Every structure is written in structure tokens, then in C-alpha cells.
Motif scaffolding. Structure first.
Motif, short mmCIF file in Angstrom:
data_model
loop_
_atom_site.label_atom_id
_atom_site.label_comp_id
_atom_site.label_asym_id
_atom_site.label_seq_id
_atom_site.Cartn_x
_atom_site.Cartn_y
_atom_site.Cartn_z
N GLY A 1 -22.93 -12.14 -68.90
CA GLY A 1 -21.58 -11.89 -68.51
C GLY A 1 -20.59 -12.82 -69.20
O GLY A 1 -19.71 -12.27 -69.88
N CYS B 1 -20.10 -12.52 -73.19
CA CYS B 1 -19.92 -11.23 -73.85
C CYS B 1 -19.35 -11.15 -75.24
O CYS B 1 -19.82 -10.32 -76.03
N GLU C 1 -19.30 -13.09 -62.10
CA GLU C 1 -19.69 -12.92 -63.47
C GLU C 1 -19.56 -11.75 -64.42
O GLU C 1 -19.52 -12.10 -65.62
N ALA C 2 -19.78 -10.50 -64.13
CA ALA C 2 -20.20 -9.65 -65.26
C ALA C 2 -19.26 -9.41 -66.34
O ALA C 2 -19.74 -9.56 -67.44
N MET D 1 -19.23 -4.69 -62.91
CA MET D 1 -19.03 -5.91 -62.31
C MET D 1 -18.42 -5.62 -61.00
O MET D 1 -18.94 -6.10 -60.01
#
Lengths: 813, 129, 380
Positions: free
Chosen positions: A448, A451, A481-482, A503
Motif C-alpha cells: 500500500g 505504490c 493503508e491500501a 482500501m
């Protein structure tokens, strides 16, 4: 007769019997009962009668024995005289041709500091003036000194009798055998003579010369005695930074910890200290001398570092030695502790390199990742080393093995912003075989945050998102996070935006993206989705979003103060945490008085009656942990007697078999059924018996855990803080307010005291006094405090609970 | 007469490098015994083979272990012995930290506190000088 | 005592046999031995272990402890060594340790304990021992002589000479050219005490009358240590030495107080001494003194318990003082008074009659000086 206190009638019978053996045995039986401390005067005439003149040594020796341990007390057969039945015919004993009887007689006679035997001990030095053994001459210097001690500090004991009266001490120096009973107060000429004797020594005798007069100009001159003083003298002539390299101290020192690992561990410490004196930062503590075993030439063969490697330990020797050894690697070599801890940690932490350093128990693995990683957080140089080693940790490729690895590294990235871009691609790999929470959590965080660096993410995440394992905590970690870092910098079949979608779904929403997430329902009740859902203002981009948070670290994060750190090497720490570091009518009236710090229980004993109470005795008793320091001693309580009798009091003792109530006080008088009566003087409590002891926060915490303290009461007059009523009262139920368990602020700030005691009740006592003093608009009950209490089966818990309210007594007679 | 006993020994120039029964490799300069290095185990001096750039030692084994002789230290100290304190100072840039303090202490023992002060890395040794 | 007790224990919870050298640890002995030896003296299989502030040294034998206890210590080796010797003596009496057999030979063991350790001081024992019991410029030519001497004296109030002795040397410093022979003539000496040393290069001459010494002097200053008495000797002050000072002490009992008059006498009035001090001691119950002296300063000093009179230089002189005393006890005997002094003469009576030098013309004996100093000079 081991110890039999009633047997004195049989001993008298056995003492004279016409059989010498029986007499010896009897007298022997008397000795053993006195030594233990039991009855002996009944016998005296019998004892004394057979033995008196004789040169036959054994009975004489036996009687001679009994005159140094009780002569004064026993008086049936002796009475009081100058030439007692201890010495009258023992002038014969002193003047026998056999050295043993004379010698023995001399030896006890002069040993006594008795004044009823002062004259007979003085020419008793005759018995040993001639020296048939080393024992005879030593016996003589010790006996003259003992005569000098016994009231003859002047001319009765100082010159010679015919060869010694305080002059064996001089003679001994030049004679074949030495021994100087001259340690204090004796002839100057002998002291001087001992110095000469240092040279012409007799070794036992040298220890006697030496206690008196020490320090030599020489190296030595010979013998253990001189040798023992000598290491003392050496430490003087070079005090500087310990002994460093231990002198003749080494020989006794090993036995000082015979149980068995502790010697090596200690020895290892000294050897490490000795190597060098380094910078002496945090766990770089090596003292002693700077150069004496150096460190680190490049021409030195086979080098210093070989011994240094031992100290780096996994357990490579045994655990006691291990704990000492890890600290010791840190201590000789590092930057602080950080450098050598990273090397040391690299060995300990889990890898694909060696399977003797990896294990499938998740916490230990995780902890080991955090220890390695904390070194980076401490010091920069370590960041560069840590990240590639961390990727090796991952390469294990068990669900769990990846998992632990991912969890710390993700924290490191929070510290270490866009520095660990490189790791992300490695970190994804083991995320697919999965049976645990931890792997999902950690991976989703790396992949995450990272990226921008990668573009893989739909593919990696998606196998896991549709795979199963355990997923509670996964939610929380994926939720914040994502998306993160750069708005559109990925793409495999889902760019960074798909990720923000994902996310959000994983957090608590719903959306087709990464073939749906594993779970959506969040971890522990408070966390929820919503904060982050609101967030991602600017879609996963470093601005004021998840990315910000992710590429930033919560509060201060530096050192090994435990701020994104863990404080050395994980195995050594368990041991350090463990270390608590704990440090007939009768009338009485009474009051307690103190004058010139004498604490006394005043008692007045009153006979309001016309009747006879003669036979009046007064006693204060020892109940248990209460004791008399001296009972009241008047023979008062007579027809219409008023008396003031003082019984001194103590609070600290050892349990007696009689009752355990308030204070027992006993007056005796006339009556034959109740010759002794128990009647009372004012209050003393059960609480006295508790013994005060203290705890530190670690001991308190350990004991909290150890046994329950759920039990609480709220005690009135705990309105006040810890210091005032509460301490004073807690003191009286032998307790003490120590360390805190509080958390104060503008909304928090109950006063918290951690209490301890170690009661003489088979329990400890602990409590926490929480004082509810308003630091909020809605207090518990306003001022007052709730005391949460325990004891080890909570039988003293209750004492704490009510003895923190109030407590006062007074009278004014 | 030298303090550390010579279990075995070798002459490198007029300087005697010897092993000691302390496992110390010391060198005799000036009638003063200096420790060139510490031996960890008991070692014997086979000889000094210029080729290898080494002194060849052997344990109990009829095999080779090697210690290169610490010539820079030896030359500093030798020069000090001769009463060529300046000369020893030329050597000093190639004497490290604690070794400069030690060599300085050598210089000092022989005499000249000041020249020892310039070479001594350690400030404390300067401060006392 | 350093060694409280020497004790044989059973860890049954009692002291089986034990020894109290002098009455102190009776019942005390049993409680210590009973608690501590049960835990191995609280040891860990270490010979020294200390508990409840008492050093316990021990050795286990079966369920029994042979125990040495101390609470003070003089040396490391010693404590073990008495225990050790005890351990040779104990199986002779009891065939190892065992409570019943230990009990039966209370007398044996106990006697050994008294013998081994006497009044807490570790004596030695042995199994045989135990048995007995249970049975060119010559213009410059000059010479200087310096006689330095110290005199010592002990004298009674009566003025009895007691013992005395003079110590001294005559140093010569000479600047003479060439090598000149010198002859020294001095008075003849006698000595109760003894000592005389001669410098090398000293020759002895025998003459029918008078004695003579001759020598070539080293140049510069050197101890002559000539022959005759020598110019390095200890002569007895007794033998014809003059004691520059005689002190006559008259103590008087004023009654409650004491009046002391001290009389000092010097040699010829013309000669004056320097650095003279008289130390007149005083008794412990001092009160305060009032002292009067014609010359010099006098001061009472507590602590020292002495009155000190100092005189820069004296032809001769005296002092008096009155003392106030509380009177504890009875009368006290007087301690001797001591004096320090310097005199410009030698009271060994060394006189340099003549030193004639040869090998040349008359040198000048520019100066002969005498320094006389007090040694231990004591008079009661």
C-alpha cells in the motif's frame, strides 16, 4: 544425652560410683546439657570430689572444661573463695610433670576474666613457661594476654614470672614458633620484635604477627600469611580504574560463586572490561584500562576478535553466561549498542540462510524482526543493512514467517520515508500462501505505502483478497493503508485508484475490486472504517491523507527508548524484564508515654479492695509479634495500693504460642485457682503483626498479575492525597505508599499509590489507593478514594481496606 | 635485564623480538621491554621470512601461523630509546589513536614530556604532560 | 575473641556439642546452629557463607555440619585452618560426624575446642597432642673546625646523674694547597657508653706523654674522625660531660592547688644558650595556671598538659607558676620535665687544643665553632 534437661538426679548417681568411666561419662553429660543451656548446680559436690588433685588427665581435663562455661553460676560444691574448687588443687594440676594437665589447667584458668580466680591464674603461667610444644609456647602468650585483659593492665601482668607474664609475645618472635597475643595494649618491645620476626617467621605465627603490624617494603618474604596481606598492599600502590587485572584476589574469588554458571558469567564480564575502555555510551560500558589487550590490529595473529565472537551469543554457552555475554558483545564494540546489536541481531533473527535461527512460533520471530529494525531507528547506517536482511527474513515463505517480517518492516517505513521503496517487490511475494492475519496486515501496508514504486498491486493483493486465513486485524491495517502514495502510478489490471476503491471496501464499504476483499468488518470495537473512508481526500497521494500518516511516524521515534524500538536483542531483554529489582481482683488504668524516645506503656495497678492480693507479681507478655522490652517489675497490688508500674513495649518479635489478641497484661496475687489473671491495658491491634515491606512498579505489577486485587471498597477520608492521612494510617497496618499507577492529565489525575507489605501471616499485602479527587466535571463520587486491595489470599486485603479511613486514640488521666 | 622472560626469541636487527611465558611477544629495545603484541596461545618463532612479509610461528603443529611484525611501532619506540624523540614523531602519523598515547608514554619514560604531548591523541595525556 | 564459638552441629535443629570459650554464647549457640546449618549454613556448597550477620564456615558430614562461626575476622587462611585441624581431630573422637556418637563424646570434642581455639584465637592442635589431655693558592690556606654535638640526660629530682651520653663529630673544612700533614691535639676522653669512629687517613701516634693524632686532610669538608677519641664518636655525657642545664624542680602542695617552682641553672654566666625551652608537665585536673617568669615567654597548654617556657637566649634564668586543680583521686606522681637547648660549646668537652699543619707556612685557623644541641634531656 543430646539434650535432656531433667536427668540431674541420675548424673549425681553416675558421678561417683567407684568406676572411673561412669564418672567421666557423667561429668560429660553435665557438659553437653549446659552447653545446650540446661540445669547443672545440683551435682556440684559430687562432681568436684573424685577429680581434684590427680595427675590423671581425663577427669581433670573434664573438670577443667566445665570451668570456662559456667564456673561462676554453679556454687553447691564450690561456693566463693579465692582458691575455689576450680583452683586450689589445680595448683598441683599446673605443677604436674605431664604437660597436658598443666597446660590445660593454665589454659582455662587464665582464660576466665573472673576476679575470684585472679590470683590463682597469675602464677598459672608457670605451667607453660617451659615449652614442650608449639602449643605450650602459644598457650602461654595467649594466657598472659588473657591475664592482662583480666584486670591486670598494670604491673600484675606485664613483666616475667620466671620467663613470661606478658613476655612470651617477645620470646615467640625469636623462638622457633611464633604466635603473638599482643594484638592490642601490650609491650612495645614485643611489637618491635615481631617486625624482626617477619624475616625469621613461623607461618601460623606470621598470621598473628601480621594482624598486628602489616605493610612490607619488599615483594614478600614467604608463606600464605605474607602473601594474603601483600595483594591488599598492591591494590594500594595502583587503585586506579579497579584492580583491572585481578591480583591474588583470583583464588578466593571463584569459590565465592561455586554454584556454577555464575563464576564464568562474572569471569566473562572482567575479561570483556579488561580488553579495552571504550567510549562508554549506552551499553558500550567497558572500563578498566584503555590498552592492555588493545583492540584490533591488522597484523595481530590470531587476533583479539576470536574471544570477542564468544560474547555474541544465541545461547552458545548456557543462559546465565548468555545474558552476560550479549551485554558484553555490546559493551566492547559498538557505536553505542546499535552497531554490534545489528550484527548480533542478524544472527538471531529469522532467515532462509540457516534454519537454526528461524522458528515457526510467530511472536519470537516478530520480536526478532523488531530488534533488528530498532537499530536502524536508532542509528542511520543500520537502515541500509536492515532492509536487505529483512527481505532474507521474508524468503522463508511460510505464511507466518513472511508475516512477522512484514509487520516490523512496515513500522520502519513509517520512520523511513521513501527510503525503503526497494523492499516492496520482495514483500509482496509471500503474501499468497497465507493462513494468518499478520501476513495480510503487513503486506497490505508495504504494498500500500509503496505504490509509486511498483505497479503490480491488483495482482498481488487479489490472490490474498480472495484467499482465506484469519482476517480480524487485517481490516484495521489494510484500512488505513491500501491506497497511498502517488495518485496513478500503478496498473496491472487495477491502478492506484482501484486500490483506493479496495482500501475503502476492505475498511467497511463494498466494491468489486481485487476480486473483493477477504473481510470488511474491522478489528477491535473502537477502530471502525469511517476515519479513513472520510480520508483519501486526495486519492492516495502524499498530501494530507493515509499517505501522510503512512510516510510519517507517530510522535518521536529515535534511539532504543522503545519509540519504534525494542531495546536491544530480544532474548537478552526477557531476562532484564524479569528482574524486578525489589528492595484475684485487679484494676488497671493505662496510657502510653514517651520520654527521651523511650516508649513505654504506663500502667497503674489498683487494688480498690480491702481483701488480700499479696503474692502480687506483674508481667507484660509476649503474645506474638508483640513483646515486652521489660515487664513492670514492682511487687504491687497490695490492700488499697495504688502504684504506677511501667511496662516497656516493642512491636516486633517472633510468634509465641500464647494468645494473639490485643495486649495481654498479667497481674498475679492471692488465689489458687486464678493465681494469674489477665486484664487489659488500652488497645493494640492484630495489624501490628504485619510486617512492612515495599515494592517497586515492576514488583507491584508482577504481583498484580500473580494474584487478583479485584476486591475494592471505597473508604471515606481518602478525600486527601496519598501523602497525608492515608500514608500515616497505612503505616500503622504496616504498609507503605510507594510507586504510582497513574496516568495524570487534564481529565486524569487520580492519585495512585502502589502498596506493599510482606505480612507475618503467610501473605504479602498490596493495594492501590486511588484518590478520586475531581479532575473532571463528573467525578466518581467527588473527593473520597477507592482503595483496590489484595493480599496473597486477601485475608490482609481487608486490613488495608478499612485502615486508611481514620485512626486515633488518646486519654488524659 | 628485562622484565618479561624469554621463552624463545629471535633477533630482528639488534632489536630482540621474543616470546614470553605470558604469551606476550615483546621486543627488547634499550634494555627496556615493550610489548609488540599479544599472542593468544603458546607460540614459537620459526623465523622471519622476508618473502611472506611475516614472522612464521608454529603451535604444537608442524604448520604455519604468521604474525607480521609491527615495524612502525617498533621503529617509533627504538628511535625513542636511542634518544631520537623527533625521529619517532615522524613515525607518529602511522601510529593510531591509543597507540600514539602509548608510544608517547614510551617517549616520556625515556624523557621529553612535550614531544610526547604532540603525538598523544588522547587529550588527558596531553593535559598531564 | 574474634571467634564466638566453635561448634559441631546436627541439622536435627540443634547444636549437638559446642564450645563457649568464655560465658557469652550458652543458649545462643544452640539457636544459631540449629537454624543456619540446616540450610547448609544457607550455603550452596561454599565453605564461607554468612547469614544473620554471622560468618559461618562449615563442612557437611552426613546430616551434620561441623561449623566454625565468627562475626569478625583477622585473616582468610586462618578461619579455614582451625576448622581443618578440627576436622582431623573430630573422626579420632567420633568416627565421622553422627549425632549419637557426637553426643557421647561431648567431653572429648569440647576439650579439643578449648585447646584449638583459645579465647577466640585460633591455636593449633593435632591427634597426638589431644592424647596428653584425655589420658698555587696557599695565600688562601685556611682551616675551619666545627664540632657538632648532642647531649642526652636522665636525672632525678635529687640531681642524680642517672645516665647521660654525648654524641658528636668534628667536621673539618680546609682550604689548603699542596698536601699538608696535620697534627691534631685534643683533650683526653673517657666514656661510660661507647663509640668512636675514625676517618681513613687518620694515623695514631704513641707518645710517652700526651696523645697525638696526625693526618693528611681531604680537601673541602669531611668528618675528621681523627684517632684519639675520634672525630666521630658517641662519648658518654656521663663521662665528663657537662650538662648545660640542671633543673631543680620544687613542687609544692598549696593545698587544693599546687605551686611549682622550676629552677634552671646554666654554666658560666658569660656563655648564653639559645632555643631553650623547659617543658613542665601538669596533672590532668588542670583548672588553669598562672605563670610568671622574668625572662622569655611561658605558656600553659592544655591537651599537652604541659607548661612550656621558651627563652630565646639565656645567660641563665628561672620561672614559677601556680596551678589550680580539681582534686579527683589522690595525689599523682610527677612526670619528668624535658628541655631543649642550644649552646655554643660542646658539652662532651671536646677542646681543640691545637691543629698544626705542615708542608707549608702557617695557615689561618679562621674559625673553630661549636654547636651543642640537646638530645633527650629529661629530669624529674
Amino acid at each position: 544425652m543430646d539434650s535432656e534437661p531433667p536427668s540431674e538426679i541420675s548424673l549425681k548417681n553416675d558421678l561417683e560410683k567407684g568406676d572411673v568411666k561412669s564418672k567421666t561419662e557423667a561429668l560429660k553429660k553435665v557438659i553437653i546439657m549446659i552447653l545446650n543451656g540446661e540445669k547443672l548446680p545440683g551435682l556440684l559436690m559430687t562432681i568436684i570430689r573424685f577429680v581434684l588433685p590427680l595427675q590423671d588427665h581425663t577427669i581433670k581435663k573434664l573438670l577443667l572444661v566445665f570451668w570456662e562455661i559456667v564456673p561462676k553460676t554453679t556454687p553447691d560444691g564450690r561456693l566463693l573463695h579465692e582458691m575455689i574448687l576450680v583452683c586450689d588443687a589445680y595448683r598441683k594440676d599446673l605443677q604436674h610433670p605431664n604437660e597436658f594437665i598443666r597446660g590445660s589447667t593454665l589454659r582455662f584458668l587464665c582464660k576466665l576474666k573472673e576476679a575470684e580466680l585472679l590470683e590463682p591464674l597469675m602464677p598459672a603461667i608457670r605451667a607453660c613457661l617451659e615449652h614442650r610444644h608449639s602449643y605450650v609456647r602459644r598457650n602461654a602468650v595467649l594466657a598472659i594476654y588473657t591475664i592482662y585483659r583480666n584486670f591486670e593492665h598494670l604491673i600484675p601482668d606485664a613483666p616475667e614470672l620466671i620467663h613470661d607474664f606478658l613476655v612470651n609475645e617477645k620470646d615467640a618472635s625469636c623462638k622457633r614458633n611464633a604466635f603473638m597475643m599482643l594484638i592490642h595494649a601490650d609491650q612495645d618491645r614485643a611489637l618491635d620484635y615481631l617486625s624482626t620476626c617477619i624475616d625469621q617467621v613461623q607461618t601460623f605465627g606470621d598470621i598473628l604477627q601480621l594482624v598486628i603490624v602489616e605493610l612490607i617494603y619488599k615483594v614478600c618474604h614467604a608463606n600464605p600469611s605474607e602473601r594474603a596481606r601483600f595483594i591488599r598492599c598492591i591494590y594500594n600502590l595502583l587503585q586506579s580504574s579497579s584492580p583491572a587485572v585481578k591480583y591474588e584476589a583470583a583464588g578466593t574469588l571463584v569459590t565465592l560463586s561455586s554454584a556454577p554458571t555464575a563464576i564464568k558469567a562474572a569471569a566473562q564480564c572482567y575479561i570483556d572490561l579488561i580488553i579495552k575502555e571504550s567510549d562508554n555510551n549506552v551499553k558500550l560500558i567497558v572500563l578498566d584500562r584503555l590498552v592492555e589487550l588493545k583492540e584490533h590490529p591488522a597484523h595481530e595473529r590470531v587476533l583479539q576478535d576470536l574471544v570477542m565472537d564468544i560474547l555474541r551469543v544465541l545461547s552458545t554457552p548456557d543462559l546465565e553466561v548468555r545474558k552476560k555475554t550479549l551485554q558484553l558483545a555490546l559493551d566492547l564494540v559498538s557505536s553505542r549498542n546499535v552497531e554490534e546489536l545489528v550484527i548480533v541481531l542478524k544472527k538471531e533473527v529469522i532467515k532462509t540462510n540457516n534454519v537454526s535461527e528461524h522458528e515457526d512460533t510467530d511472536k519470537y520471530r516478530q520480536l526478532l524482526v523488531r530488534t533488528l529494525h530498532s537499530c536502524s531507528v536508532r542509528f542511520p547506517d543500520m537502515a541500509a543493512n536492515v532492509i536487505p536482511v529483512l527481505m532474507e527474513f521474508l524468503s522463508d515463505s511460510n505464511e507466518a514467517a513472511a508475516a512477522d517480517v512484514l509487520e516490523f518492516v512496515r513500522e520502519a517505513i513509517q520512520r523511513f520515508d521513501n527510503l525503503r521503496m526497494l523492499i516492496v517487490e520482495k514483500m509482496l511475494e509471500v503474501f499468497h500462501a497465507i493462513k494468518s492475519v499478520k501476513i495480510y496486515r503487513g503486506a497490505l501496508w508495504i504494498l500500500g505505502e509503496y505504490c509509486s514504486t511498483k505497479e503490480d498491486i491488483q495482482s498481488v493483493m487479489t490472490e490474498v483478497r480472495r484467499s482465506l486465513g484469519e482476517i480480524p486485524i487485517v481490516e484495521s491495517e489494510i484500512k488505513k493503508e491500501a491506497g497511498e502514495l502517488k495518485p496513478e502510478e500503478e496498473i496491472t489490471v487495477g491502478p492506484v485508484q482501484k486500490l483506493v476503491t479496495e482500501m475503502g471496501t476492505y475498511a467497511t464499504q463494498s466494491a468489486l475490486s481485487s476480486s473483493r476483499p477477504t473481510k470488511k468488518e474491522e478489528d477491535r470495537p473502537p477502530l471502525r472504517g469511517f476515519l479513513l473512508d472520510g480520508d483519501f481526500f486526495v486519492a492516495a497521494s502524499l498530501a494530507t491523507t493515509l499517505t501522510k500518516i503512512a510516510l510519517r511516524y507517530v510522535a518521536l521515534v529515535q534511539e532504543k527508548k522503545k519509540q519504534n524500538s525494542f531495546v536491544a536483542e530480544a532474548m537478552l531483554l526477557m531476562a532484564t524484564i524479569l528482574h524486578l529489582g525489589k528492595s484475684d481482683p485487679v484494676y488497671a488504668e493505662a496510657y502510653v508515654h514517651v520520654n527521651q524516645y523511650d516508649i513505654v506503656l504506663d500502667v497503674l495497678v489498683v487494688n480498690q479492695t480491702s481483701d488480700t492480693l499479696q503474692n502480687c507479681t506483674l508481667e507484660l507478655a509476649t503474645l506474638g509479634d508483640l513483646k515486652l522490652v521489660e515487664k513492670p517489675s514492682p511487687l504491687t497490688l497490695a490492700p488499697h495500693d495504688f502504684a504506677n508500674i511501667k511496662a516497656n513495649v516493642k512491636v516486633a518479635s517472633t510468634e509465641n504460642g500464647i494468645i494473639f489478641g490485643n495486649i495481654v497484661y498479667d497481674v498475679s496475687g492471692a488465689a489458687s485457682d486464678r493465681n494469674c489473671v489477665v486484664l487489659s491495658d488500652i488497645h493494640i491491634d492484630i495489624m501490628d503483626y504485619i510486617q512492612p515491606a515495599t515494592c517497586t512498579d515492576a514488583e507491584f505489577r508482577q504481583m498484580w498479575a500473580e494474584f487478583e486485587w479485584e476486591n475494592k471498597v471505597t473508604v471515606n477520608t481518602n478525600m486527601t492525597d496519598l501523602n497525608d492521612y492515608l500514608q500515616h494510617i497505612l503505616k500503622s497496618t504496616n504498609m507503605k505508599c510507594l510507586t504510582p499507577e497513574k496516568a495524570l492529565s487534564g481529565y486524569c489525575g487520580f492519585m495512585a499509590a502502589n502498596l506493599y507489605a510482606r505480612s507475618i501471616f503467610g501473605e504479602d499485602a498490596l493495594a492501590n489507593v486511588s484518590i478520586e479527587k475531581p479532575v473532571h466535571q463528573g467525578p466518581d463520587a467527588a473527593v473520597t478514594g477507592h482503595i483496590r486491595i489484595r493480599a496473597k489470599s486477601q485475608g490482609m486485603a481487608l486490613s488495608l481496606g478499612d485502615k486508611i479511613n481514620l485512626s486515633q486514640k488518646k486519654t488524659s488521666l | 635485564e628485562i622484565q618479561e622472560i624469554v621463552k624463545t626469541g629471535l633477533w630482528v636487527g639488534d632489536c630482540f623480538i621474543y616470546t614470553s611465558s605470558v604469551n606476550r611477544l615483546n621486543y627488547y629495545v634499550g634494555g627496556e621491554i615493550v610489548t609488540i603484541a599479544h599472542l593468544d596461545r603458546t607460540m614459537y618463532l620459526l623465523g622471519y621470512i622476508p618473502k611472506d612479509n611475516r614472522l612464521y610461528l608454529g603451535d604444537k603443529e608442524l604448520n604455519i601461523v604468521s604474525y607480521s611484525l609491527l615495524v612502525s611501532v617498533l621503529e617509533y619506540q627504538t628511535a625513542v630509546m636511542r634518544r631520537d624523540f623527533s625521529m619517532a614523531d615522524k613515525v607518529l602519523p602511522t601510529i593510531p589513536k591509543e597507540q600514539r598515547t602509548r608510544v608517547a608514554h614510551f617517549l616520556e619514560k625515556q624523557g621529553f614530556k612535550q614531544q610526547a604531548l604532540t603525538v598523544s591523541t588522547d587529550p588527558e595525556h596531553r593535559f598531564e604532560l | 575473641m574474634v571467634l564466638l564459638a566453635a561448634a559441631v552441629c546436627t541439622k536435627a535443629g540443634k547444636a549437638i556439642v559446642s564450645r563457649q570459650f568464655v560465658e557469652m554464647t550458652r543458649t545462643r549457640i544452640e539457636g544459631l546452629l540449629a537454624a543456619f546449618p540446616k540450610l547448609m549454613n544457607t550455603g550452596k556448597q561454599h565453605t564461607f557463607v554468612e547469614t544473620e550477620s554471622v560468618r559461618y564456615v562449615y563442612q557437611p558430614m552426613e546430616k551434620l555440619y561441623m561449623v566454625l562461626i565468627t562475626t569478625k575476622n583477622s585473616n582468610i587462611l586462618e578461619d579455614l585452618e582451625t576448622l581443618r585441624l578440627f576436622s582431623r581431630v573430630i573422626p579420632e573422637y567420633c568416627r565421622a560426624l553422627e549425632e549419637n556418637e557426637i553426643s557421647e563424646h561431648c567431653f572429648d570434642l569440647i576439650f579439643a575446642f578449648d585447646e584449638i581455639v583459645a579465647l577466640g584465637y585460633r591455636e593449633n592442635v593435632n591427634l597426638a597432642q589431644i592424647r596428653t589431655f584425655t589420658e698555587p693558592p696557599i695565600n688562601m690556606e685556611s682551616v675551619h673546625m666545627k664540632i657538632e654535638e648532642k647531649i642526652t640526660l636522665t636525672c632525678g629530682r635529687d640531681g642524680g646523674l642517672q645516665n647521660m651520653e654525648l654524641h658528636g663529630m668534628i667536621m673539618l673544612r680546609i682550604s689548603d694547597d699542596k698536601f699538608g700533614r696535620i697534627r691534631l691535639h685534643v683533650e683526653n676522653e673517657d666514656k661510660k657508653g661507647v663509640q668512636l669512629q675514625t676517618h681513613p687517613n687518620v694515623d695514631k701516634k704513641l707518645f710517652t706523654a700526651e696523645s697525638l693524632i696526625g693526618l693528611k686532610n681531604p680537601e673541602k669538608s669531611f668528618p675528621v674522625n681523627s684517632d684519639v677519641g675520634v672525630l666521630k664518636w658517641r662519648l658518654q655525657t656521663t663521662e665528663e660531660s657537662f650538662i648545660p642545664l640542671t633543673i631543680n624542680c620544687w613542687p609544692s602542695e598549696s593545698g587544693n592547688g599546687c605551686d611549682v617552682n622550676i629552677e634552671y641553672e646554666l654554666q658560666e654566666d658569660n656563655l648564653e644558650l639559645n632555643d631553650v625551652v623547659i617543658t613542665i608537665p601538669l596533672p590532668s585536673g588542670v583548672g588553669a595556671p598562672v605563670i610568671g617568669e622574668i625572662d622569655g615567654e611561658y605558656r600553659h597548654d592544655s591537651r599537652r598538659n604541659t607548661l612550656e617556657w621558651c627563652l630565646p637566649v639565656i645567660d641563665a634564668k628561672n620561672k614559677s607558676g601556680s596551678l589550680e586543680f580539681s582534686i579527683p583521686g589522690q595525689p599523682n606522681d610527677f612526670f619528668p620535665v624535658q628541655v631543649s637547648f642550644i649552646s655554643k660549646k660542646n658539652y662532651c668537652n671536646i677542646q681543640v687544643t691545637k691543629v698544626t699543619q705542615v708542608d707549608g707556612n702557617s695557615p689561618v685557623r679562621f674559625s673553630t665553632e661549636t654547636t651543642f644541641l640537646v638530645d633527650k634531656y629529661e629530669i624529674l
